[PDB]
Design a protein around this ligand. Structure first.
Ligand SMILES: N#Cc1ccc(N2CCN(Cc3ccc(COc4cccc5c4CN([C@H]4CCC(=O)NC4=O)C5=O)cc3)CC2)c(F)c1
Ligand SMILES: [Zn+2]
Lengths: 384, 1127
């Protein structure tokens, strides 16, 4: 429980200086026409459900994938990441397209190892998984559309009380008696036309966009001390994607939130999960508590969970906890490729099964969080 | 594979905009009202509003204004549709053909754009140079107003302020100038722009940005010579003209915010305001400042006029008459009399225009006539909440009406030689007896020679031997008809006062006190026949033919019908039926081609009975609730055969087909006393004398729907009907302010605070001064008098959601099951609720049972003697144990909140607000639910209903209707588990509730009707619909005839029907499929004969062998009349 002093300058982890510094950057964005079928290459050796807006680092070594990256960059820069189900071996029906923005090629070790960073952009469905003899299979991809709905009172609204539907900004910021009182009048004035329908105002508040985001922000701030507008988007779509990325949930739930096509439904699902979720247990054991619900913080602007690459290319999603339980450390704290600029990782293992639950990030300087940082991964971590 | 047919049984009533101006002609003053898709044009006169036109447009009116460009004699009307169909219309009449021609028309939507949160704004330049539309965020769309712009081509000008609240054109500018209030992170600001048509871009405003109140809502443009604008907030009203500035903060307006306004003076000296809770304010501008001819403002005094209905649109008609247009109440027409001030109110109501919306819940019950439905809705909200009863009735058309000071009785009289034409009518006041002779349309009254001016007349008809008996309390006098002079006058044998006297063609029976006399009719002589005495007081008498074989008598106390020989006192029969009160009136007739005698008591109830033609008495016992007032039964020959009129608080017409006397509720508020009439002006008509006035007219077809109100002065949420108790259980809620004493005081006398017996829930299963808290009640209401018999008040902070009236298990009793939820402002999603089982008996509500559930009970249904409840996202089945305690049987956990539950057999249709329709089946052999089919599509659903075992009907966003069908014959599981969608329609209304039933007589008819089933839906605007099924052949024929009608019928605004009915949504639009527009098919009867022939040329009408390519024209008339008869 370390409050107040959280001095890390929590933006470096979302820059990945471990993965090379002089990283070549790419100008901007792209767009795929909605409800269209395209041909997208699939980069292999990746097994993770990449939520849109989530950064994915990558190290690629094999010649086929390097050449695939090469001809991708010279023709568009988008590939496909498939949301693999519980069954492996190409048992995927949905996925997301990752766009490159950061590139470097290294000739070291007599190899053409490529260090590349991407972020997901769109959401899609695979019709059939076509396989190409080169090794890089291309799928024919159908762009699953994004649904944004109007206000639930827009249909039943009165044409007079319409100029009374632009609220003054939230008073001050993140202050009591400035929220519980502001939100009451906000609900009272926004859903005044709920009297014409057959439902109470609070029911329509359960399907509101601002209200659901506010509840998620409140609970998240209860977990970690967020900086109000600490890169949390105002758009419900982007906020839903960020929260879905940062929730410590199992794979089936991520696939389920990936299936949802509307922001409001996604937010209701996320509240259901994070209100019904208390403990996170070791998947290989399903018997030992390494964590809890209140003990989750963020050194990254992307939240308590982020995607990182070890020097062997494997991708890990890491969760930060103050004081982990039932973990044993082995090895001296070393800092060759620590993903956090200033700490020294020590591998931790389950007290019974001895699985790579994560790392303990001990400090190096003295004006840091002192040896209290467990970056546990998801390979053995099931919500319970 | 749906093939449905949707029709409107009652047009929308809620007003969402009204204007006035010289529209029909430059001399007339017209009031134009848009209710939704309907535009009604009235003419303002001294007596009130005279309707001129009703035109139905192919869209929802979002904006209308009246403008007059140069070179025009009368105003044109610019109407914009909710689908962005702009049009400019012009009134044109030639004697009798009334036409609204379309001057211009065009869609003005944009290919890309999010519609504004504050909605569509439509404004017109006061000099009539341009039309400004704010449809989309950050874009002001401008339509130049030129004679050559007949397609309404428009251009977009960029607005840098994305959040624009209100914008209007200023008055008195050389070039068009707009002024608007917008939102910024720094606060709210007012700004002005100079729109330039040639440059097609804005310019610099005459007066720059000024900071305004943080809650500035409306801008009103003050006309010359003041100029400038007035911005009204929640606490202050400010006037801006650049250098000139005023601001006031009156405390009278702090209670509620102003939402509507309307200028009342052509020079803008006074303005009229209305607020959210419905009170009229009166802004006053003083022009006392005048330096060198310039007129400048000096004060902003605000005055409160009074309290009216909750208004959405105000309008000032001529001579201090204000039309208060309500949308969630009733429209009003009030007077701004400044001298009345009876207790401090400047307003008095003149008229009240009915408004059924918003219909929150509705039910079909057989209140009066078995087989024919009656609709009971839950209309209005806040203080206008009411119960409204909709009924089919035989409306009466009035020919000639002359007001009367509440006549107490009328009788036709003839003062001419016998020619089957009665040109006179003897009235009957309390003690006075006037006679008015009306050969044509005359209303002057002259006293008859044979009767005194004031004698308290009882019977005055046509006496025998060409005479006229004008009876009175003192004596029975008959005056010769042709000589117009008295020939005989027999005094009462007992020398007393005669109360009830009955006269027939040949025999007369007059009763005084407890003794009666029978007198024969003789030429110029009143020859007494006999006399008799009664055991008790003679309440009523009747001798129906001319010597009757029996007489009628009722007792004041015993209240038993006695029948005896006409020429003596020899009794023949008697019978006592209840006898709760004195029998108001008893009469016998042969309307059913058989001898029947009916009695009507003082409570309005009626007891039919049978009688023999020669001699003998039958029982034929039946109880009828005609009304809550005494019923003066009468017979009028100008009918099918005889019929019967039962005048009461709710008048009725009795008519028998073969042996079942059916009731036709006449479409009138009150009739009091009635009579036939055979005058030359109105032959074979009826003269009715209502409490306030009187009329003479005829009857019409059933093409009428009557709405009777029951105000509750609070919002009614849900309604159910209990037959065994003859009662209505209605949920309701009232707003109570939190006073500084720990309690909650009310705001006005509501139906919950004015009940006979009251209760407060007492269960133990588990702020700021000024906050409004909602208090929920279950009211038990009588079905006849509509008086609140009971009012149960629930716990604090408990919201009652649902209500069902049903019997469970083997228990003979019927109960009210109410599902509640404990909601607290701190928490968003309730954690605990309560299922409470009440039982109404002996005029007292007793809590039979309590169950505590963990969640909100959003809905409940009666699933084959087992209560089916939806606690949050879990559907649960309860069994009524023999110990009167609910027990859990089976659960089913969903990922959606089961807001909607509809059952048909063993098929639970489950919904949520996200249009995630799900189907469940309850397998009984194992006792658990199973999922059959699923249809998930992100969209807002308002309602859902099970049409039949395969098709499910629902309403969703952008006022649409849809029909989903499961293919149970599919050989693939993925299609079996999927609900294919087979019907789309743009209804144009927001439907809250679906219910099975029909408002017309349920006749099997052997051959039945092509329409199978009937589902009624209620909308926010107050429009009742009706959807039925059709066969494939009829669907194809009606579709072809619809497509051929679309090329003949010319719509106003030239909106294509295909576009108007196409399934619309903010993201995607599709054509309507599987739905037949009943309004269009029904409008086919109103077209002319050449258009009649143009529509039908190759329809291939016959389907029962052959095609008969001619198809005629009267075959489609027969088909369309058959479709007309279903509602
Ligand atoms: N074909 C082919 C091919 C060609 C070339 C290859 N090269 C081999 C040599 N590699 C250099 C090297 C190796 C070894 C280290 C030690 O670091 C390791 C080792 C193993 C796992 C992890 C770490 C660190 N670490 C976490 C701990 C938590 C934290 O904070 N951060 C982390 O990174 C791990 O999980 C450092 C540098 C470069 C690549 C190749 F591997 C394949
Ligand atoms: Zn373990």
């Amino acid at each position: 429980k370390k409050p107040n002093i959280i001095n890390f300058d929590t933006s470096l982890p979302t820059s990945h200086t471990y993965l090379g510094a002089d990283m070549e950057e790419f100008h901007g964005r792209t767009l795929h026409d909605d409800d269209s079928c395209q041909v997208i290459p699939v980069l292999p050796q990746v097994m993770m459900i990449l939520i849109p807006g989530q950064t994915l680092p990558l190290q690629l070594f094999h010649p086929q994938e390097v050449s695939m990256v090469r001809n991708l960059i010279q023709k568009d820069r988008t590939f496909a990441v498939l949301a693999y189900s519980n069954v492996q071996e190409r048992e995927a029906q949905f996925g997301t397209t990752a766009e490159i923005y950061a590139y470097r090629e290294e000739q070291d070790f007599g190899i053409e190892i490529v260090k590349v960073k991407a972020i997901g952009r769109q959401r899609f469905k695979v019709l059939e998984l076509r396989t190409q003899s080169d090794g890089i299979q291309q799928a024919k991809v159908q762009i699953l559309p994004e649904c944004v709905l109007p206000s639930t009172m827009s249909a039943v609204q009165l044409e007079s009380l319409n100029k009374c539907q632009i609220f003054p900004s939230k008073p001050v910021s993140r202050e009591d008696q400035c929220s519980y009182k502001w939100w009451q009048k906000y609900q009272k004035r926004k859903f005044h036309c709920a009297n014409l329908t057959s439902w109470p105002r609070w029911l329509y508040s359960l399907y509101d966009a601002e209200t659901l985001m506010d509840r998620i922000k409140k609970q998240l701030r209860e977990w970690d001390e967020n900086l109000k507008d600490d890169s949390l988007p105002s758009n419900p779509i982007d906020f839903s994607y960020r929260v879905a990325a940062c929730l410590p949930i199992d794979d089936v739930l991520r696939i389920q939130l990936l299936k949802i096509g509307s922001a409001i439904q996604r937010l209701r699902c996320e509240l259901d999960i994070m209100n019904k979720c208390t403990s996170l247990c070791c998947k290989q054991c399903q018997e030992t508590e390494i964590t809890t619900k209140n003990e989750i913080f963020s050194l990254s602007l992307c939240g308590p969970m982020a995607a990182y690459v070890n020097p062997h290319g494997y991708v890990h999603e890491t969760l930060t906890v103050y004081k982990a339980c039932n973990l044993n450390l082995i090895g001296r704290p070393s800092t060759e490729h620590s993903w956090f600029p200033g700490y020294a990782w020590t591998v931790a293992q389950c007290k019974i099964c001895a699985s790579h639950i994560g790392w303990k990030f001990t400090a190096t300087k003295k004006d840091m969080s002192p040896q209290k940082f467990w970056g546990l991964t998801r390979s053995a971590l099931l919500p319970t | 594979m749906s093939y449905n047919y949707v029709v409107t049984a009652q047009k929308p009533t809620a007003v969402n905009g009204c204007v006035t101006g010289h529209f029909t002609s430059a001399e007339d003053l017209n009031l134009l009202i848009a209710k939704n898709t309907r535009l009604e044009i009235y003419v303002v006169t001294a007596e009130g509003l005279r309707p001129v036109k009703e035109v139905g447009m192919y869209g929802k009116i979002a904006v209308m204004e009246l403008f007059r460009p140069k070179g025009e004699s009368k105003d044109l009307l610019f109407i914009l549709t909710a689908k962005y169909n702009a049009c400019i219309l012009e009134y044109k009449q030639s004697g009798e053909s009334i036409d609204i021609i379309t001057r211009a028309h065009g869609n003005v939507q944009d290919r890309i754009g999010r519609p504004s949160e504050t909605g569509i704004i439509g404004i017109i330049d006061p000099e009539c140079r341009m039309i400004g539309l704010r449809l989309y965020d950050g874009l002001f769309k401008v339509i130049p107003l030129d004679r050559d712009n007949k397609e309404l081509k428009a251009f977009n000008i960029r607005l840098e302020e994305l959040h624009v609240i209100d914008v209007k054109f200023l008055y008195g500018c050389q070039a068009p100038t707009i002024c608007f209030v917008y939102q910024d992170p720094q606060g709210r600001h007012v700004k002005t722009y100079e729109v330039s048509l040639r440059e097609k871009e804005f310019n610099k405003g005459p007066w720059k940005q000024e900071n305004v109140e943080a809650e500035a809502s409306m801008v009103i443009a003050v006309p010359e010579p003041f100029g400038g604008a007035i911005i009204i907030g929640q606490e202050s009203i400010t006037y801006h003209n650049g250098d000139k500035y005023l601001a006031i903060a009156p405390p009278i307006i702090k209670q509620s915010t102003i939402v509507c306004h309307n200028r009342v003076d052509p020079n803008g000296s006074r303005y009229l305001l209305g607020d959210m809770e419905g009170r009229l304010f009166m802004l006053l501008l003083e022009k006392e400042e005048q330096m060198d001819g310039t007129v400048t403002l000096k004060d902003l005094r605000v005055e409160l006029l009074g309290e009216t209905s909750i208004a959405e649109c105000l309008t000032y008609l001529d001579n201090g008459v204000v039309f208060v247009g309500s949308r969630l109440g009733d429209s009003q027409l009030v007077k701004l009399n400044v001298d009345s001030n009876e207790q401090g109110s400047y307003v008095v109501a003149m008229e009240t225009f009915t408004n059924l919306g918003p219909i929150v819940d509705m039910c079909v019950v057989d209140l009066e006539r078995q087989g024919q439905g009656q609709l009971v809705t839950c209309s209005g909200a806040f203080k206008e909440g009411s119960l409204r009863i909709i009924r089919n009735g035989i409306g009466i058309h009035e020919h000639a009406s002359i007001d009367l000071p509440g006549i107490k009785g009328l009788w036709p009289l003839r003062s001419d030689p016998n020619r089957e034409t009665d040109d006179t009518l003897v009235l009957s006041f309390v003690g006075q007896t006037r006679v008015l002779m009306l050969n044509g349309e005359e209303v002057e009254e002259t006293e008859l020679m044979g009767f005194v001016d004031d004698q308290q007349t009882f019977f005055c008809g046509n006496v025998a031997h060409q005479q006229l008996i004008q009876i009175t309390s003192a004596s029975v006098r008959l005056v010769s008809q042709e000589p117009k002079a008295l020939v005989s006058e027999w005094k009462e044998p007992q020398a007393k006062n005669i109360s009830v006297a009955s006269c027939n063609s040949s025999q007369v029976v007059v009763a005084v006190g407890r003794a009666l006399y029978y007198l024969q009719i003789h030429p110029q002589e009143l020859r007494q026949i006999s006399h008799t005495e009664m055991e008790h007081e003679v309440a009523c008498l009747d001798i129906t033919p001319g010597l009757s074989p029996l007489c009628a008598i009722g007792l004041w106390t015993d209240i038993s019908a006695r029948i005896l020989k006409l020429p003596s006192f020899e009794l023949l029969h008697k019978e006592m039926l209840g006898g709760e009160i004195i029998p108001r009136s008893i009469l016998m007739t042969t309307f059913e081609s058989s001898h029947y005698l009916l009695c009507a008591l003082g409570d309005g109830a009626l007891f039919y009975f049978g009688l023999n033609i020669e001699t003998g008495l039958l029982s034929d016992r039946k109880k009828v609730t005609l009304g809550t007032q005494p019923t003066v039964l009468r017979t009028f020959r100008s009918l099918s055969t005889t019929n019967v009129f039962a005048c009461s608080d709710r008048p009725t017409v009795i008519y028998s087909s073969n042996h079942k006397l059916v009731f036709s509720n006449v479409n009138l508020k009150e009739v009091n006393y009635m009579c036939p009439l055979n005058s030359d002006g109105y032959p074979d008509s009826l003269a009715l004398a209502n409490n306030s006035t009187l009329t003479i007219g005829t009857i019409d077809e059933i093409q009428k729907l009557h709405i009777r109100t029951v105000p509750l002065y609070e919002s009614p949420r849900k309604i159910c009907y209990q037959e065994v108790s003859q009662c209505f259980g209605v949920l309701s809620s009232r707003i109570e302010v939190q006073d500084t004493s720990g309690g909650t005081t009310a705001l006005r006398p509501s139906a919950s605070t004015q009940a006979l017996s009251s209760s407060v829930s007492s269960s133990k299963l588990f702020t700021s001064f000024g906050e409004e808290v909602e208090v929920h009640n279950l009211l038990i209401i009588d079905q006849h008098t509509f008086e609140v018999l009971h009012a149960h008040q629930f716990l604090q902070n408990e919201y009652a959601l649902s209500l069902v009236s049903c019997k469970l298990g083997k228990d003979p009793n019927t109960y009210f099951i109410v599902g509640t939820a404990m909601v607290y402002p701190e928490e968003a999603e309730p954690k605990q609720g309560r299922i409470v089982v009440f039982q109404y008996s002996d005029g007292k509500l007793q809590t039979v049972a309590e169950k505590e559930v963990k969640g909100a009970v959003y809905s409940m249904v009666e699933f084959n003697g087992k209560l089916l409840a939806s606690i949050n996202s879990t559907v649960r089945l309860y069994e009524w144990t023999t110990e009167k305690e609910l027990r859990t049987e089976c659960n089913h956990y969903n990922n959606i909140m089961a807001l909607y539950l509809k059952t048909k057999g063993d098929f639970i249709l489950v919904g949520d607000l996200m249009r995630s329709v799900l189907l469940l089946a309850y397998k009984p052999m194992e006792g658990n639910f199973e999922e059959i089919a699923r249809d998930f599509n992100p969209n807002w659903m308002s309602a859902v209903e099970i049409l039949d075992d395969d098709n499910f009907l629902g309403a969703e966003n952008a006022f649409n209707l849809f029909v989903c069908q499961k293919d149970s014959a599919a050989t693939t599981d993925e299609e079996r588990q999927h609900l294919q969608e087979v019907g789309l329609f743009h209804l144009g209304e927001f439907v809250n509730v679906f219910c099975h039933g029909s408002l017309v007589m349920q006749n099997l008819g052997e051959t039945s009707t092509p329409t199978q089933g009937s589902v009624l839906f209620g909308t926010v605007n107050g429009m009742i619909g009706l959807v039925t099924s059709l066969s494939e052949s009829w669907y194809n024929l009606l579709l072809d005839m619809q497509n051929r009608l679309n090329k003949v019928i010319k719509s106003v605004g030239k909106i294509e029907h295909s576009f108007w009915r196409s399934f619309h949504t903010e993201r995607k639009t599709e054509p309507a499929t599987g739905f037949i527009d009943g309004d269009l098919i029904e409008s086919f009867l109103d077209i002319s004969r050449p258009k009649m022939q143009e529509v039908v040329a190759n329809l291939q009408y016959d389907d029962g062998s052959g095609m008969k390519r001619e198809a005629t024209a009267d075959d489609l008339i027969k088909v369309v009349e058959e479709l007309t008869r279903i509602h």
